[PDB]
Amino acid sequence: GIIIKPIISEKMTAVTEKMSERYGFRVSPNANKIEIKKAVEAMYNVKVEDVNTMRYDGKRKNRYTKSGLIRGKEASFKKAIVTLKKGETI
Amino acid sequence: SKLHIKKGDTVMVISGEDKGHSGRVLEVLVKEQRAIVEGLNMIKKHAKPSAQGGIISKEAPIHISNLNVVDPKTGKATRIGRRLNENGKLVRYAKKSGEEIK
Amino acid sequence: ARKHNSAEARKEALKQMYFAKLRNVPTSPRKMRLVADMIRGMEVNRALGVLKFSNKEASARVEKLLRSAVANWEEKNERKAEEGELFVSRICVDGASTLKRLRPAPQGRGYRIRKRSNHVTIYVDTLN
Amino acid sequence: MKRTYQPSNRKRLNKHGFRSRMATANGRRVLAARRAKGRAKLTVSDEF
Amino acid sequence: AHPKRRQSKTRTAKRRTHDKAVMPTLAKCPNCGAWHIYHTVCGDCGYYRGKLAIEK
RNA sequence: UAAGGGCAGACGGUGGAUGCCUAGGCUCUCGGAGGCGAAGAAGGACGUGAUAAGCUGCGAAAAGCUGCGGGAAUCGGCACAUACGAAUUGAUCCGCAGAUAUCCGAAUGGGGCAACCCGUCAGGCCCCUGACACAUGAAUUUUCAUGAGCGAACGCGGGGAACUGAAACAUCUCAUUACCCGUAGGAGAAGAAAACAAGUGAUUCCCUCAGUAGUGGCGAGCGAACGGGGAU
RNA sequence: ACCGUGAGGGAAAGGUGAAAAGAACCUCGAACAGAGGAGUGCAAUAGACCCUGAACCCGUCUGCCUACAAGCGGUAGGAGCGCCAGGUGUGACUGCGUGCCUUUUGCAUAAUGAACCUACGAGUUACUGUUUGUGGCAAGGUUAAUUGUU
RNA sequence: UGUAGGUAUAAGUAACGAUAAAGGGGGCGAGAACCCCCCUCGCCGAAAGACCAAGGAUUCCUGAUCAACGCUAAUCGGAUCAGGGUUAGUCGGGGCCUAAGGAUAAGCCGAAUGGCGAUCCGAUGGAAGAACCGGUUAAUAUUCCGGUACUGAUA
RNA sequence: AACCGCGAUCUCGGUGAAAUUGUAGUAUCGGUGAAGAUGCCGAUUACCCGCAACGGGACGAAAAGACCCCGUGAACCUUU
Ligand SMILES: [K+]
Ligand SMILES: [K+]
Ligand SMILES: [K+]
Ligand SMILES: [K+]
Ligand SMILES: [K+]
Ligand SMILES: [K+]
Ligand SMILES: [K+]
Ligand SMILES: [K+]
Ligand SMILES: [K+]
Ligand SMILES: [K+]
Ligand SMILES: [K+]
Ligand SMILES: [Mg+2]
Ligand SMILES: [Mg+2]
Ligand SMILES: [Mg+2]
Ligand SMILES: [Mg+2]
Ligand SMILES: [Mg+2]
Ligand SMILES: [Mg+2]
Ligand SMILES: [Mg+2]
Ligand SMILES: [Mg+2]
Ligand SMILES: [Mg+2]
Ligand SMILES: [Mg+2]
Ligand SMILES: [Mg+2]
Ligand SMILES: [Mg+2]
Ligand SMILES: [Mg+2]
Ligand SMILES: [Mg+2]
Ligand SMILES: [Mg+2]
Ligand SMILES: [Mg+2]
Ligand SMILES: [Mg+2]
Ligand SMILES: [Mg+2]
Ligand SMILES: [Mg+2]
Ligand SMILES: [Mg+2]
Ligand SMILES: [Mg+2]
Ligand SMILES: [Mg+2]
Ligand SMILES: [Mg+2]
Ligand SMILES: [Mg+2]
Ligand SMILES: [Mg+2]
Ligand SMILES: [Mg+2]
Ligand SMILES: [Mg+2]
Ligand SMILES: [Mg+2]
Ligand SMILES: [Mg+2]
Ligand SMILES: [Mg+2]
Ligand SMILES: [Mg+2]
Ligand SMILES: [Mg+2]
Ligand SMILES: [Mg+2]
Ligand SMILES: [Mg+2]
Ligand SMILES: [Mg+2]
Ligand SMILES: [Mg+2]
Ligand SMILES: [Mg+2]
Ligand SMILES: [Mg+2]
Ligand SMILES: [Mg+2]
Ligand code: NA
Ligand code: NA
Ligand code: NA
Ligand SMILES: [Zn+2]
Known about the structure:
This is part of a larger assembly, with chains A, B, C, D and E.
Chain A: E1 3-6, H1 10-18, E2 22-27, H2 33-44, E3 48-56, E4 60-64, E5 69-73, E6 77-84
Antiparallel strand pairs in A: 1-2, 2-6, 3-6, 4-5
Chain D: H1 9-16, H2 18-23, H3 25-37
Chain E: H1 9-16, E1 26-28, E2 35-37, E3 47-48, E4 51-52
Antiparallel strand pairs in E: 1-2, 3-4
The structure holds four RNA strands.
């Protein structure tokens, strides 16, 4: 299960209202395009055309305790914009 | 360590502002060794409007060493022990009358 | 019972004092004391005009404090103050906690900067 | 005025990195001493 | 260039004798009935010397 | 006249002293145990929660999975939380035994700027994947066991200062110390007379002998053994 | 944490309350910025930096003094005024008076040293000698290591 | 010229960091010399404009906030909190090759730890197969969309 | 030497350090004195409190004098 969660955002909504065969997933950072493609085919029973990926490092954050301050980090992830064949949706 | 009271028991307050009052155990806080007795130790909590607010009257926990199991013979708030009367299974019995507590 | 009795006596004494307080104002106490010394002893409406048109910055906060003190007088007397009836009978400025910062100086030296705070207390009473 | 520290990541890792410390016996001595003191950072390879 | 001694509280207060905040020059509005700075437009009503100057 | 100032008292401000308190230290006693690691260590990286994880725990089976024994009403770790669930058909919790256990690291398929890059051969899927194997040295006969690395003190061995003292300093002292390096075990080393002595009878340790015999720019200093009493 | 290229160096920081019952609501204000109430509580001058709450340092009020006066700031006299029944605050005016430590033949010294307060800070212990105060035995005195019973 | 913490004095004093410069009208707001829009003025213009790399590491965009930070105030910010944002067969890098140098093989040297020693590693150099015109976001574009192509494997 | 312009300077609003510091109600002259006195003696002068301006004194501040001597102190350099 390399797919973590779908991307619900204004940019994804705009690109899906434009193209309607495009869907954005957030996946594990070490999964390459071929396995992302096979995984979405397994999880949704669709034929996939092309995959675009970009790596995000975690945001640095400031955890606040009673006394002072601690420096922490969010987890890294990989974005996967997925183009289905013309005719199918998710 | 297993406790001398449990939820669903009727206890009597042997010390405090509510000394000499009996009630039913609602919840037990094992970590801090306190229990909520129904109708006893009322507090007025100020709550801001959230999911109208107001002044809610509620029950505050009592330390369990201030509570004793009520004897089911005279209601005298006895001490309890444990024995194997019920087919060898450990059960709680009152020391003032020898009757088991069910 | 001793602390309860002392607290009851203090609470009963508080009912006949008409005052307001401003605490932890981030501003020099020595500069606030100039305005306090200016308005000490004045009739309240004249003092309000003086604070409204003064050329010192601290007068803006002192004006709100004096308005609050007048409101406290009105609440504790259960009426409204007539014109020219109240005056500023007591006012003091105290030093509060200080924030400490560092400012760089030439040749690598560093100097401390003190950002001071103050408290103000205002009493009002009738011109007796 | 040019100051003493002129950063270069390749030079930093070549001079003070984990593999360069592990290469010699005295570098392993340094690593053992830092581990015994209990340092959260062991080499310059730790920082990011 | 350098103080030979620290100043006493008395010496400091004696110097600060002449530090004071200036009282504003306030006139009363005979008609409007409020405070404003003398020789200045009364900002509550906008009048100056009996004539409207700033129209609200 | 007090613009201001001085002294005292009362009441405040600031600041955090003092008093009281605490399982956080310090020093020991008794009994165990004295290692972990190629079946992959110590120490790390990256993940893992209903809600971001800072610690804790765990490892793609990821605040966790299985069995046996104990036990009986709450439980779902902590940094002042709600939700939602589990649980008398016996949860959670405790003892013993198991399963899983990513990447780096002696790191061992080849490299490398630790936590990454690139491969070969046998299979299985299907350009890409998951699961095997693929280092080197020593006994050994290519089958086999063993080793490498880390780590408190104590042991043995190989090298080995100087400041200092001698009121300077070179013999001497500091000292076969500090430090560097190699290598064991639960202890190690030593040990059964080609011995001491002027009769005793292998080693080791304690009390004496004794600051004695000696030694020494006979200076500063250093300093036994025999014998006797014990532990064994 | 911070500092250093690195080896390495290396802090500060505990306490509401029995129980969060951790202050619904009202008033002033743009706002809790803050406060005054109400309420909880034995206690809120226990209100989140919260037990107690000292000094240096900073204010307000009350009493007395002070604008013809000149040196370590006190000390010994001594009117008047002012408070609570012989005590207490202040003090017109008078006499005397060159801080302290250290170092020196000798320091007001223009020799040294300190901004102030609170806290911290410097003849200790072991062994072996020797002298002495007090003791036990006494021509004798005393055990060391160690061993038994508890 | 002792140490830690706190608080004074000098003192509301020095200073607020290039003498390129500002004026007015509207907006929002409790509050405006400084924030937003417009007009006028001034400064740079082989730069004080536009790009690549090193280095930095979310500072980028949006909504809330003005406690602390900003040498003034602030409704503003490279500030606090939350959300969002970086898309490649053709761009750059790496996968390939070697230089200085480094680690080693066979061997050599040496109380120990170790020191030398030709294949491997190692760019700052060599080889790299391969387009584009137009649109498009608050924030990416030779990377997304539409047209025109090219290049390498494989059946 | 005179005049001129801007920046600093001066006044007001906002922010706000430092060196220094035994306590000070800290005058002048002569004398005295560890031998050059705000502080001692005798006289003289002087109503209380600021601001601008200048540098004679406070043997002004800073840095436990580098010159000189001393220590059976140290380092480095030379040599029959
Ligand atoms: K694409
Ligand atoms: K990419
Ligand atoms: K009890
Ligand atoms: K042996
Ligand atoms: K209390
Ligand atoms: K207490
Ligand atoms: K106090
Ligand atoms: K006197
Ligand atoms: K001197
Ligand atoms: K000094
Ligand atoms: K905004
Ligand atoms: Mg941020
Ligand atoms: Mg301020
Ligand atoms: Mg103003
Ligand atoms: Mg600098
Ligand atoms: Mg002045
Ligand atoms: Mg006080
Ligand atoms: Mg598995
Ligand atoms: Mg069971
Ligand atoms: Mg290797
Ligand atoms: Mg010597
Ligand atoms: Mg505000
Ligand atoms: Mg109190
Ligand atoms: Mg307190
Ligand atoms: Mg006269
Ligand atoms: Mg007079
Ligand atoms: Mg002399
Ligand atoms: Mg003298
Ligand atoms: Mg001296
Ligand atoms: Mg001094
Ligand atoms: Mg002196
Ligand atoms: Mg001191
Ligand atoms: Mg000094
Ligand atoms: Mg001055
Ligand atoms: Mg400057
Ligand atoms: Mg200036
Ligand atoms: Mg970069
Ligand atoms: Mg921005
Ligand atoms: Mg500001
Ligand atoms: Mg921002
Ligand atoms: Mg090569
Ligand atoms: Mg290159
Ligand atoms: Mg951009
Ligand atoms: Mg000036
Ligand atoms: Mg000013
Ligand atoms: Mg003289
Ligand atoms: Mg003189
Ligand atoms: Mg003097
Ligand atoms: Mg001088
Ligand atoms: Mg000297
Ligand atoms: Na006065
Ligand atoms: Na490998
Ligand atoms: Na000058
Ligand atoms: Zn009018």
